[PDB]
Swiss-Prot record, chain B:
Originating gene: S
Full-sequence portion shown in this chain: 103 to 136 of 1273
Residues glycosylated per entry: 20
Function statement: Attaches the virion to the cell membrane by interacting with host receptor, initiating the infection. The major receptor is host ACE2. When S2/S2' has been cleaved, binding to the receptor triggers direct fusion at the cell membrane. When S2/S2' has not been cleaved, binding to the receptor results in internalization of the virus by endocytosis using host TFRC and GRM2 and leading to fusion of the virion membrane with the host endosomal membrane. Alternatively, may use NRP1/NRP2 and integrin as entry receptors.
Protein name, UniProt field: Spike protein S1
Subunit details: Binds to host ACE2. RBD also interacts with the N-linked glycan on 'Asn-90' of ACE2. Cleavage of S generates a polybasic C-terminal sequence on S1 that binds to host Neuropilin-1 (NRP1) and Neuropilin-2 (NRP2) receptors. Interacts with host integrin alpha-5/beta-1 (ITGA5:ITGB1) and with ACE2 in complex with integrin alpha-5/beta-1 (ITGA5:ITGB1). May interact via cytoplasmic c-terminus with M protein. May interact (via N-terminus) with host bilirubin and biliverdin, thereby preventing antibody binding to the SARS-CoV-2 spike NTD via an allosteric mechanism.
Taxonomic source organism: Severe acute respiratory syndrome coronavirus 2
Length: 49, 34
């Protein structure tokens, strides 16, 4: 139930929140909402045991 | 008023003022304008 962000186009300002979940584009191939080989989901869940 | 923000689907500020009951709603939600 707890998530964190790995990929972002730039850094953050001091005290800035980010809500929008857009698919990251790591290369020249566009994603267009489809997580392909160069497109990754930006929110990965914590694993707590 | 002014509607400060970026990439107008996510976040974005909204300063509607002069309600004639003198109110300064500066609500910051997610909006879709126009």
């Amino acid at each position: 139930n707890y998530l964190y962000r790995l990929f972002r186009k730039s850094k953050l300002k001091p005290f800035e929140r980010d809500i929008s979940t857009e698919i990251y584009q790591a290369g020249n191939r566009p994603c267009n909402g489809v997580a392909g080989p160069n497109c990754y989901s930006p929110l990965q869940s914590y694993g707590f045991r | 008023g002014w509607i400060f923000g970026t990439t107008l689907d996510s976040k974005t500020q909204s300063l509607l003022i002069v309600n004639n009951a003198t109110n300064v709603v500066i609500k910051v939600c997610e909006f879709q304008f126009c």
